[PDB]
Amino acid sequence: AFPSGKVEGCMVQVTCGTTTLNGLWLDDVVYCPRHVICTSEDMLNPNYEDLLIRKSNHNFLVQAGNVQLRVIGHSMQNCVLKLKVDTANPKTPKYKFVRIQPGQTFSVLACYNGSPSGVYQCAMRPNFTIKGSFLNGSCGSVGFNIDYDCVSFCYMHHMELPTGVHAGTDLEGNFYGPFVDRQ
Numbered sequence: 001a002f003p004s005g006k007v008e009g010c011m012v013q014v015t016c017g018t019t020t021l022n023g024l025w026l027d028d029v030v031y032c033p034r035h036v037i038c039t040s041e042d043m044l045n046p047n048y049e050d051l052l053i054r055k056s057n058h059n060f061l062v063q064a065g066n067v068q069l070r071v072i073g074h075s076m077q078n079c080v081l082k083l084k085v086d087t088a089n090p091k092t093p094k095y096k097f098v099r100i101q102p103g104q105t106f107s108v109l110a111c112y113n114g115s116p117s118g119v120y121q122c123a124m125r126p127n128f129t130i131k132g133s134f135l136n137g138s139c140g141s142v143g144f145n146i147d148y149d150c151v152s153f154c155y156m157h158h159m160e161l162p163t164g165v166h167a168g169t170d171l172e173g174n175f176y177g178p179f180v181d182r183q
Contacts, residue, residue, distance in 0.1 A: 030082070
């Protein structure tokens with residue numbers, strides 16, 4: 001797998017109500033799966049536009065380790081929520097966002113509640129899923145490749161499907177495969 005040090009410094013925890021998951025902090029934006037704004041009932045047929053208008057910046061609790069970051073804006077880009085915070089990450093690496101395809105390998109930094117747990121090499125199967133228990137409970141973890149000094153982020157985990165495999169999006173919030181973020 002690729003060394004994970006440059007990506008470890010970007011992982012944060014995002015909490016909205018009773019849901020907590022991982023987010024990616026680059027410059028002064030935190031990226032995370034938009035279903036963080038859903039309750040359990042909401043996930044069956046969520047109306048994300050209506051849910052978002054009722055959320056204020058203070059409903060999002062973002063923690064980088066022991067430090068709380070203040071959210072000063074929020075917007076949706078396809079299936080990813082973008083939280084503007086009032087502090088740029090001083091550990092932001094050189095990066096770009098890329099969309100990949102099945103069979104292309106990448107490394108995933110699996111985190112629990114914003115804390116790095118392991119780094120693993122994987123690839124999506126031809127049906128755009130990942131099989132592998134290293135993503136269990138790791139919603140919002142990201143996948144990346146490293147090219148010299150530049151991190152290419154290519155994947156964000158959004159959900160575990162009923163069959164025990166994992167689905168996710170690119171960092172523009174577009175799903176890989178024919179999946180939607182609802183149960």
